[PDB]
Amino acid sequence: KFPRVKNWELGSITYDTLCAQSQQDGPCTPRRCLGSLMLPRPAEQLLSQARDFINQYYSSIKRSGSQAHEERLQEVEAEVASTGTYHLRESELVFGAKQAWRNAPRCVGRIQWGKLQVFDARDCSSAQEMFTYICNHIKYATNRGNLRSAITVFPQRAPGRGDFRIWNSQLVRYAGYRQQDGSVRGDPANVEITELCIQHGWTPGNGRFDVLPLLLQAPDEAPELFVLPPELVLEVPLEHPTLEWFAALGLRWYALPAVSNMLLEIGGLEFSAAPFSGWYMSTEIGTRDLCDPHRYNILEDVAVCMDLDTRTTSSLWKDKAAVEINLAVLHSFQLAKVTIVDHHAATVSFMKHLDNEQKARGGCPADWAWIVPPISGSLTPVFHQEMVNYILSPAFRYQPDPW
Amino acid sequence: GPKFPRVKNWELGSITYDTLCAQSQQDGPCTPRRCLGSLMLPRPPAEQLLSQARDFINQYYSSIKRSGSQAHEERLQEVEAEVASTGTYHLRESELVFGAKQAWRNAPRCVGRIQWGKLQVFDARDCSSAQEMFTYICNHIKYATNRGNLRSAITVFPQRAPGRGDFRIWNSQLVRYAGYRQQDGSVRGDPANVEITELCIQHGWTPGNGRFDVLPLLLQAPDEAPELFVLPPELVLEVPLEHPTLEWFAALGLRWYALPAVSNMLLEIGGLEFSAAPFSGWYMSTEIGTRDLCDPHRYNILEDVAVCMDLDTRTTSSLWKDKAAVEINLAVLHSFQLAKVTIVDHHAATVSFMKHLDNEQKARGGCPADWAWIVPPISGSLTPVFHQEMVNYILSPAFRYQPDPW
Numbered sequence: 106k107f108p109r110v111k112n113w114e115l116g117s118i119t120y121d122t123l124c125a126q127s128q129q130d131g132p133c134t135p136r137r138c139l140g141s142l143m144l145p146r147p148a149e150q151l152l153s154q155a156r157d158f159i160n161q162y163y164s165s166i167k168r169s170g171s172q173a174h175e176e177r178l179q180e181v182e183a184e185v186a187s188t189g190t191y192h193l194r195e196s197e198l199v200f201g202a203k204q205a206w207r208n209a210p211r212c213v214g215r216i217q218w219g220k221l222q223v224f225d226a227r228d229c230s231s232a233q234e235m236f237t238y239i240c241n242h243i244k245y246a247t248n249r250g251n252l253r254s255a256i257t258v259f260p261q262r263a264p265g266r267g268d269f270r271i272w273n274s275q276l277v278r279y280a281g282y283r284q285q286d287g288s289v290r291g292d293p294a295n296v297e298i299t300e301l302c303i304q305h306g307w308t309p310g311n312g313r314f315d316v317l318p319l320l321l322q323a324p325d326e327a328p329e330l331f332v333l334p335p336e337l338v339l340e341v342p343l344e345h346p347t348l349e350w351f352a353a354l355g356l357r358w359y360a361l362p363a364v365s366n367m368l369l370e371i372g373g374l375e376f377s378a379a380p381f382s383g384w385y386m387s388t389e390i391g392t393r394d395l396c397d398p399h400r401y402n403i404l405e406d407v408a409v410c411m412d413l414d415t416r417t418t419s420s421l422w423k424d425k426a427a428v429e430i431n432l433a434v435l436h437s438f439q440l441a442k443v444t445i446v447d448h449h450a451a452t453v454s455f456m457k458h459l460d461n462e463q464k465a466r467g468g469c470p471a472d473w474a475w476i477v478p479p480i481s482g483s484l485t486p487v488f489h490q491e492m493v494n495y496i497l498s499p500a501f502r503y504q505p506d507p508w
Numbered sequence: 509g510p511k512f513p514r515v516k517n518w519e520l521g522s523i524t525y526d527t528l529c530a531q532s533q534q535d536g537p538c539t540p541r542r543c544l545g546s547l548m549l550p551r552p553p554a555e556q557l558l559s560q561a562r563d564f565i566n567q568y569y570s571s572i573k574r575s576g577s578q579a580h581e582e583r584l585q586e587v588e589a590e591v592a593s594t595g596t597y598h599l600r601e602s603e604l605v606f607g608a609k610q611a612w613r614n615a616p617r618c619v620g621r622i623q624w625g626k627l628q629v630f631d632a633r634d635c636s637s638a639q640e641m642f643t644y645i646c647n648h649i650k651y652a653t654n655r656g657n658l659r660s661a662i663t664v665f666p667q668r669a670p671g672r673g674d675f676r677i678w679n680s681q682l683v684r685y686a687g688y689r690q691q692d693g694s695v696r697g698d699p700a701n702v703e704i705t706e707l708c709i710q711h712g713w714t715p716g717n718g719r720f721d722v723l724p725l726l727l728q729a730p731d732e733a734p735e736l737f738v739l740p741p742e743l744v745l746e747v748p749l750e751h752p753t754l755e756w757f758a759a760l761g762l763r764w765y766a767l768p769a770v771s772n773m774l775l776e777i778g779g780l781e782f783s784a785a786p787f788s789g790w791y792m793s794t795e796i797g798t799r800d801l802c803d804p805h806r807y808n809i810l811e812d813v814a815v816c817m818d819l820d821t822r823t824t825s826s827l828w829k830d831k832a833a834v835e836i837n838l839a840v841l842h843s844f845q846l847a848k849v850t851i852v853d854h855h856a857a858t859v860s861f862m863k864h865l866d867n868e869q870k871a872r873g874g875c876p877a878d879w880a881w882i883v884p885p886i887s888g889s890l891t892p893v894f895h896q897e898m899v900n901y902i903l904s905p906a907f908r909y910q911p912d913p914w
């Protein structure tokens with residue numbers, strides 16, 4: 106009933122008791138494990154999710170059972186009973202947001218979970234206004250290369266009307282232009298979103314790195330187009346510490362990883378537009394973004410530049426180039442004074458985080474296939490660390506694309 | 509639409525449904541509340557045995573296309589009659605061959621499964637002493653090794669019997685290096701093997717004092733204490749390790765053995781349990797180059813090599829670990845190739861597993877697969893399998909872990 110959890114490098118053992126607080130089913134059953142899938146497919150119920158969350162909050166500030174706690178429970182009941190919904194207080198929002206990060210099983214950066222700047226944008230009534238907040242968030246989060254984790258929360262969903270939505274999957278993204286050749290110029294991941302932008306009247310560039318505009322949707326209205334002022338979008342040109350020719354590849358990446366298509370659930374309330382950012386781990390750029398075959402697919406190009414044997418897999422040309430590319434990323438970010446974390450530092454701090462959460466909560470939900478980096482996996486301590494995965498609330502969930 | 513798990517490859521954008529999972533008769537460790545997929549080890553009655561056997565026999569008759577036939581219903585009848593009077597039954601020779609291969613085919617954690625259909629099955633169900641076990645194993649090693657042109661093989665000893673001790677091989681692999689615990693707490697040799705080494709010494713082995721001493725075999729026949737057997741060195745092919753360009757690498761004195769032969773697993777077929785049934789294949793380079801040589805709790809040579817390579821080991825962001833690891837892996841491949849000893853790199857191994865996935869889709873409607881184990885420990889997303897969703901579930905016949913005999 107309580108899972109024994111073992112680290113195979115050190116022979117140490119814990120027990121996850123936290124998983125007993127899961128109220129939401131995952132995809133696995135005793136018959137088959139579906140844990141490597143990316144997405145598997147009343148008032149009473151909101152009220153009890155709301156109760157639980159308010160309880161989580163008052164306990165977190167140690168005022169559990171106090172008058173303030175009782176009267177807030179009553180406020181919530183009064184509100185659901187009359188209106189079918191309720192609203193969060195700003196500090197409750199702040200607590201839920203941090204907790205949603207904390208509960209995120211696919212996130213290796215959770216050591217930082219308590220350091221999060223939260224912008225309340227719930228007084229937002231237009232796509233225009235959404236853009237102003239988005240700009241402030243970017244200016245703040247970027248902070249001249251000295252990245253600071255942030256979230257911005259737009260108005261919750263409501264039963265009789267459409268969602269506030271950011272169509273873009275991240276705040277900063279490079280266009281992907283389908284060519285005549287069936288080829289793709291730019292980021293292949295953003296072909297569809299580039300097309301949408303164009304359908305809504307954007308004049309498109311024709312580079313491998315064109316920063317895309319945002320499509321912002323206020324309730325029940327067409328999406329609106331907003332260009333980010335180049336000045337707000339910090340970018341880092343990639344070079345390599347020893348290989349002079351690398352810079353000539355003209356490669357570059359944006360500083361700010363800001364997810365914008367995920368839904369934030371707090372005490373049963375859903376926030377369909379709640380972008381959040383922190384900073385990159387180098388393997389995301391150096392390994393996935395640049396080396397995935399269905400992304401920029403630069404591996405072969407680099408290896409030929411390195412005069413490596415492409416003829417055969419056994420020279421490990423792929424592994425050699427990947428390392429250099431990840432190295433280029435760390436070097437370049439370090440030269441441009443922009444926050445980055447390599448995958449050894451990140452995962453060492455994740456181990457520390459599992460230890461903190463063991464003492465603090467009796468466990469930590471973690472998704473092994475996501476926590477382990479995409480190169481050099483067993484070289485990192487997370488690789489040898491058994492992990493239990495499950496869903497706690499507050500939570501970030503995936504949501505369907507708005508079109 | 510389809511009432512079965514949807515499985516997607518994210519590189520290619522293709523989709524399949526696993527319908528094979530419906531055949532699973534045994535629960536794994538996950539539940540709707542929590543996924544326990546990353547756990548290494550998660551935590552006879554006549555009717556029970558009979559239904560397992562009936563299922564296997566049905567499986568056998570399917571694979572030769574005689575399902576529902578007179579030979580099929582007669583063999584069913586012959587099996588229950590046997591259980592009726594003795595509480596067990598026995599496999600026909602060709603049933604054992606089918607079941608053994610099926611166990612390999614069924615193994616979620618093996619990336620080599622495209623080779624499943626090519627397995628030499630040695631039937632050693634006549635074996636009646638620890639000495640004879642030794643003989644059989646020597647024959648296995650000789651055949652499987654084939655002077656570097658490695659051949660997949662398995663040797664099957666007698667099955668578990670009611671009120672009779674098991675046949676057991678104490679060593680977890682037929683070929684393992686000794687691990688000698690030191691005065692200064694550290695370990696000489698392979699740390700993985702401390703316990704078995706200590707068990708061999710207790711049982712009268714005169715030990716060496718190197719980093720690569722081939723352990724002796726501790727072999728156990730029913731109701732007997734285990735007997736000790738030294739492998740004659742001419743039988744254990746090893747590859748001295750060198751780098752194609754870094755000339756100093758050969759001076760490190762590293763080596764590995766050719767034949768990966770697992771010896772501590774239970775092979776279950778139709779309820780029947782084969783406690784001793786060593787199987788062997790050939791290595792994937794990452795097993796040696798990444799896991800065995802670089803795990804912090806094994807040989808742990810990453811710092812040594814990175815120093816030699818003159819890397820900055822004082823900071824993580826030099827990726828000194830990543831660089832050294834690549835060269836150690838390249839060294840494994842290069843040296844095996846040079847010695848003409850079969851090996852496969854993690855890129856070819858994974859490509860060929862994708863192909864195996866497509867074969868099994870067509871043939872069985874799915875393929876049980878443990879993502880954490882199929883993905884290599886270096887260069888993960890550089891291999892196609894990283895982007896392949898996988899369904900994991902237990903089919904039988906199967907290989908199982910079993911508790912150490914001591």
Ligand code: HEM
Nearest residue numbers: 206209211212213214217254255381382383384385386501
């Ligand atoms: C502060 C530095 C951070 C680092 C270095 C970091 C690192 C990572 C990495 C490597 C992943 C896997 C990403 C992928 O493969 O696409 C990830 C996922 C995730 N992160 Fe973090 N993260 C950070 C901050 C944050 C913040 C501030 C939040 C929210 C407040 C957050 C929430 C999430 C969530 C919800 C996922 C899962 C995304 C998905 O399922 O697609 N992270 N993070």
Ligand code: HEM
Nearest residue numbers: 612615617618619620623660661787788789790791792907
């Ligand atoms: C033909 C060449 C083969 C290759 C390249 C190969 C590769 C591998 C690899 C890399 C592993 C993971 C082991 C680890 O991480 O320590 C593995 C596991 C496994 N292999 Fe294969 N294998 C091969 C042949 C075989 C054969 C002949 C059998 C049995 C007939 C087999 C059955 C298994 C089983 C049962 C596991 C799971 C081990 C465990 O649960 O600890 N393999 N294989």
Ligand SMILES: Cc1cc(N)nc(CCc2cncc(CCc3cc(C)nc(N)c3)c2)c1
Nearest residue numbers: 143144362364381382383384385386389503
């Ligand atoms: C806050 C944060 C920090 C950081 N360093 N990295 C991230 C990762 C962001 C990220 C980038 N690209 C892709 C994804 C996941 C994309 C994704 C994947 C799937 C399966 N469904 C979706 N709806 C979306 C996340 C987030």
Ligand SMILES: Cc1cc(N)nc(CCc2cncc(CCc3cc(C)nc(N)c3)c2)c1
Nearest residue numbers: 548549680768770787788789790791792909
């Ligand atoms: C046939 C075969 C081919 C191949 N290429 N590799 C293998 C490797 C098998 C292997 C190697 N090292 C270690 C293990 C695990 C041993 C092992 C033993 C016990 C009792 N519990 C565990 N969880 C694991 C398995 C086997």
Ligand SMILES: C[C@H](O)[C@H](O)[C@H]1CNc2nc(N)[nH]c(=O)c2N1
Nearest residue numbers: 141142474475518894895896897
């Ligand atoms: C199918 C497979 O689970 C999928 O490719 C996952 C694996 N692990 C991952 N891990 C991280 N951090 N990011 C990813 O996108 C993925 N992709």
Ligand SMILES: C[C@H](O)[C@H](O)[C@H]1CNc2nc(N)[nH]c(=O)c2N1
Nearest residue numbers: 488489490491546547548880881
């Ligand atoms: C904790 C984790 O499950 C464990 O370290 C697994 C991960 N994947 C693996 N994969 C293989 N092939 N071999 C292993 O020993 C492991 N170890």
Ligand SMILES: [Zn+2]
Nearest residue numbers: 133138538543
């Ligand atoms: Zn699972």
